[PDB]
Structure formats: structure tokens, C-alpha cells
Amino acid sequence: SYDRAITVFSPDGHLFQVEYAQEAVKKGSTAVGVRGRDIVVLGVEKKSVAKLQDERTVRKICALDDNVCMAFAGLTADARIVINRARVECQSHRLTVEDPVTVEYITRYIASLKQRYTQSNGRRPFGISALIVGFDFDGTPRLYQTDPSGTYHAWKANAIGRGAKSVREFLEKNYTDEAIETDDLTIKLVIKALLEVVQSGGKNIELAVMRRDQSLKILNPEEIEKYVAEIEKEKEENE
Template sequence: MSDRYSFSLTTFSPSGKLVQIEYALNAVAQGVTSIGIKATNGIVIATEKKTASPLIDDSSLEKEIGAKIQESLQRIPTNGNASEGGYDETGPALYQVDPSGSYWAWKASAIGKNMVNAKTFLEKRYNDEIELEDAVHTSILTLKEGFEGQMTENSIEIGIIGGDTAGFTEGKQQPFFRKLTPSEVRDYLANIA
């Protein structure tokens, strides 16, 4: 009996809350801002690119991000602590997943330090007919609202998830993920400035 009681004390607070989940949610709220937007023809995921130290090798972060998004394309919804996007049987899908395993489908969402302001901005700008090109612009404008410092092609990352219109398997679109190159991001930034 004492083992079960001690397990409960390490998992739950005296008020019955799962403390570990609250800590995880607070950590996410303090992280970099990330935006997810569902378009009619895909998903845009954009994030600030910040490292905790100038000694961190930024190229290793890119490989981890690309691999994670590609992996998530195969299993939507996923358990984790992020916005996840991809295609399901109905087309593009954007989910926000919290550490408890709860998830919600969104048209547009934000996580991170500036998520409240970003969600307010998205509520004003989002429409159900938005396409990938406009969703990229909207994601940049949303990040720009609360961005600290200068926004450049090296300080943000943008990925798009779309359906391959040329390749169908049993009548279903094949999803793809592509991270925009720094040159492409620079072009988008030039058009917004």
C-alpha cells in the first residue's frame, strides 16, 4: 500500500494535478515561437531559430527538425509536445499535441513565448481559403509581431507539407515535406518588408 501512495505523491500534487505536465507546458510556453497554418493545399510550419549558445552547431538542429517532421507525416496525430502537420485521409491536417497526450485539430495555431499574441494575430488574418503561398507570408508576419532582434533567413525556419499531385497510391495523395532554403526565406522576407 505504501508503494502505491508514494507513487501518487511523485506523480500528482496535493490538489490532484499532474505536476510533470504543468512543468512541461510551462517549458513550452517559454520556448521559441512556432506557427502552424493549415492551407487548402498543405501545411506551413514556421519557427524562430535560436540556440542557447553560439557554440552550438546549427546544422545539427536542422537535421533533427527535418527528420522529426518527416517521421510525423507517417503518423498523424502523434504524441509529443508540438504542432504537427501532415496529410490524413481528408487532406491537410494540423494538430497541436500537449504532454498529456491530448491533441486538437487546428486551422492555425502557435506555441512558444509569444503564443498568445501570435494566436490573436492569426485569428485576424486566417481564412479558410488560404493557400500555401499566402500561408507562408502569414506565418512570417505572425512571427514578426513578437520577434526579438532582426528577422533574417538565418533566424527563422519554414517548412511546408503538401500533397504530391503527381503521385497517387490507391487514390491517395502522397505527402511531402520540404524545408525552404535560406535563399527562399530571404525572398519571402524581402517581399514582406
């Protein structure tokens, strides 16, 4: 019983820092991710270019292997350390059994490390929640999410960061059965998610794709302008 420390329970059976460390994620930048049937795609919002510096270093979407893709929320330093560890874990797994690394094993690694990191004596838990997207077994699209407690939790679409309830609520009203594939409709689905974002500034949108066989492709802020134009065309056709 108190917000210190991590080790003792509440008198009604809670952990304060486990519950409180998710708030740092919940005040963090928004990053969504869906799975198609063949091409999986995701993206972050709030690029927030401050007019005088470069932004190629602030990239919140990366990869550990050619088959898996990353995202996170919360603070950036824990994401840096966890991904730098996870690359070496992926490569050590590759040094073992010669398969491409399954998404399930590396999510069990990351959440397990995060949890046994939390259980120890006075280590501040990683206030992040990762998005781990891959299509490995005959191109079966999978995306799991993490938690500061360290619970991998398999979804079909995902939304975190600021206002994640509303952004996930849009996918409730959007995600019918016949999404994909239909890759173009998955493209427009990512575009409608970016239009349903908390700010949807139009130029602060950064999205990355994976066709389950190719590499990670960073798009261009003219294709997305065409996507916003055809989405506004669909809104006018609704009228």
C-alpha cells in the same frame, strides 16, 4: 499536496507536475504551423547560430514518414526520444496494415505513450508538445498538437514556445477564410507569421513546407528575404 510527487492530487484537485511541466514548454522555442488547402507549411524560430559551429544537427523539424511532419517545444532530449520511438512506431504500423500512416493514429500513440509514461511510478514526464502535420486521406490537411498531460487537440493553426498567446493572437487577426489555396497567400501567411514572431530577426527564421504529395523542402535565406521585402512593400502600400 505538494509539488512532489506526480502521484497525489492537490487538496483542490490538481496535479502540480502536470501543470508545472507545461512551463518548460512555455519557456521554450517558438514554432508555428498552419494548414493550407493543399500545401502545409510550418517553421521554427530562434536558429541562434553561435558563429563557430554547424547547425545541421539542431534541426527541430523532422519526419517519421514521407507523409507526416514534426515540430516540438520544451527540452530537446525528450523530443529526441519521442521521435526515435515514433519512427519505429510508424514503421511497425507500416509492418502491419499497409496504409500510409494516418496522423490521428500516430498522435494517439504519442499522447498515449506520454500519458501512460506519466501515470507510472516516478518517471519524469516529457516536457514537450509536438506538432504533427500531415495530409493523408485524399490530401486532407491535418495538424494536431500534443500536451505534457498527453491530450491530442486538433487545430487549424498553431503557435507554441515563448509568447505563444501573442503569436496565436496574430493568427486570429490574420486567418480569414480565403487563405488557401492560393498557395502564394499561404506562403505569405507563413512569412507574416515569421514577421510577427517575438524577435523576427530575419536570418534566424527556418521554415519547412509540404505540398501534401512531395517531400519536406527546406527553403533558402534569399527567397525569405524577398518575402520580407514584399511584406514591407505591403506595409508601405498600407500607408
